[PDB]
């Protein structure tokens, strides 16, 4: 199939990844990686607000998001990863999504507490996710 490439820009990716999973920078609590013109994945956007995160996915591309969140109700911070696979994304990339999301979860964005598959904004309702995060088990 069409394997994902997240090692070419591993430098840029890992830099944001560590910041987020460690919580070492309040300005950066989430990251979305998207494929460039050469089909290489690199950081597309980062931000501090989880609410902004959920609204920053591209409906024409398969992307992966990573966010460190603390649901209202506790001070525990947990990690959620999102496999964004919109209908409009290129056929071949959508067909390789299940395989590539698994790769991202096992090799790139390791240490997540919650894993979600999304296709559109309805799959990214903030309250629904804050609930999943709150009911999550260990990393």
Curated annotation (Swiss-Prot):
<protein>
    <recommendedName>
        <fullName>Actin-binding protein</fullName>
    </recommendedName>
</protein>
<comment type="subunit">
    <text>Binds F-actin, but not G-actin. Interacts with the ARP2/3 complex. Interacts with APP1, ARK1, PRK1, SCP1, SRV2 and YIR003W via its SH3 domain. Interacts with the SH3 domain of RVS167 and with SLA1.</text>
</comment>
<comment type="similarity">
    <text>Belongs to the ABP1 family.</text>
</comment>
<comment type="function">
    <text>Regulates ARP2/3 complex-mediated actin assembly. Recruits ARP2/3 complex to sides of preexisting actin filaments, which may promote nucleation or stabilization of filament branches. Binds to actin filaments, but not actin monomers. Actin binding is required for ARP2/3 complex activation. May also have a role in linking the actin cytoskeleton to endocytosis. recruits components of the endocytotic machinery to cortical actin patches, known sites of endocytosis.</text>
</comment>
<feature type="domain" description="ADF-H">
    <location>
        <begin position="5"/>
        <end position="134"/>
    </location>
</feature>
């Amino acid at each position: 199939l069409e394997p994902i490439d997240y090692t070419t820009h591993s430098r840029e990716i890992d830099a944001e990844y560590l910041k987020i999973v460690r919580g070492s920078d309040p300005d950066t609590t989430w990251l979305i990686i998207s494929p460039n013109a050469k089909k290489e994945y690199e950081p597309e956007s980062t931000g501090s607000s989880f609410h902004d995160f959920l609204q920053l996915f591209d409906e024409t591309k398969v992307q992966y998001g990573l966010a460190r969140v603390s649901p209202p109700g506790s001070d525990v911070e947990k990690i959620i990863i999102i496999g964004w696979c919109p209908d409009s994304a290129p056929l071949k990339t959508r067909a390789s999504f299940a395989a590539n999301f698994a790769a991202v979860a096992n090799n790139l964005f390791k240490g997540y507490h919650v894993q979600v598959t999304a296709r559109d904004e309805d799959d990214l309702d903030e309250n629904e996710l804050l609930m999943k995060i709150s009911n999550a088990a260990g990393a």
